[PDB]
């Protein structure tokens, strides 16, 4: 075993699991999902006495994994089984497409006003238990190149027009499950080349949520060391989930 030495000792035997997932979406203006997927990895941080035999179990047949590689130390077939390296390492990588929780729904509305103004209202809805908070929320709304100026009103958060980047950027520190928020913007237009139709790019979002969008959920982590005089019940165990946007585009 060339990834872990033999005489390791700790007064306090503790591990930490991180389930880290990126969730990706492309949605039509109607509300059809054109494309969606999750990339995820499990990271372990282990301060454990000896050379222990850990067994890792999740709800894996309960949601549906499309494929996944593992670390050297994993012995194949099922629940997963290994003697971990000490400290921090990558236990597995994985992908999932069926049955994804999409944390946010984006509902755009756009109206033209002669050749002089655009009217835009965007509504975000959060879709998860109310006991949980999303944080670090950005909503990016693109503006035409003939844009002369922009007014916004928003009851929650803060929004500036960023002329360099040709976009309105709306930021929110935190927001809870099953809620609704809206922004309005009036976009003042310069006159333009007449047969230039605007190709309306997507509205895109960023966020972080404390659950796995894939549905995945940790069911046991069991530690057994036969030589030494601590059992499973002696180990102090912790889990966290961090689900973050990848590409999350909603077409207007």
């Amino acid at each position: 075993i060339g990834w872990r030495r033999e005489g390791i000792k700790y007064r306090r035997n503790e591990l930490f699991l991180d389930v880290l997932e990126s969730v990706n979406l492309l949605m039509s203006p109607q509300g059809q999902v054109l494309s969606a997927h999750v990339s995820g990895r499990v990271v372990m941080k282990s301060y454990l006495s000896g050379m222990p035999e850990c067994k890792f179990g999740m709800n894996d047949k309960s949601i549906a994994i499309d494929d996944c590689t593992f670390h050297q130390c994993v012995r194949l077939s099922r629940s997963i089984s290994f003697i971990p390296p000490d400290g921090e390492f990558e236990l597995m990588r994985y992908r999932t497409t069926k049955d994804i929780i999409l944390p946010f729904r984006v509902i755009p509305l756009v109206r033209e006003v002669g050749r002089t103004k655009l009217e835009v209202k965007v509504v975000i809805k959060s879709n998860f238990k109310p006991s949980l908070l999303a944080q670090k929320i950005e909503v990016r709304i693109p503006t035409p190149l003939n844009t002369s100026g922009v007014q916004v009103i928003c009851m929650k958060g803060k929004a500036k027009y960023k002329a360099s980047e040709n976009a309105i950027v709306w930021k929110i520190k935190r927001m809870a499950g099953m809620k609704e928020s809206q922004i309005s913007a009036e976009i003042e237009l310069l006159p333009t080349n007449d047969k230039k139709k605007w190709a309306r790019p997507p509205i895109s979002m960023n966020f972080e949520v404390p659950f796995a969008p894939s549905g995945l959920k940790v069911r046991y982590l069991k530690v057994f060391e036969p030589k030494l005089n601590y059992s499973d019940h002696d180990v102090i165990k912790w889990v966290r989930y961090i689900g973050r946007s990848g590409i999350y585009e909603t077409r207007c």
Binding site: L17, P210, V218, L221, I236, K237, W238, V239, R240
Partner: peptide, 6 residues
């Protein structure tokens, strides 16, 4: 932010 699992 780390939930007891023990």
């Amino acid at each position: 932010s780390y939930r007891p699992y023990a």
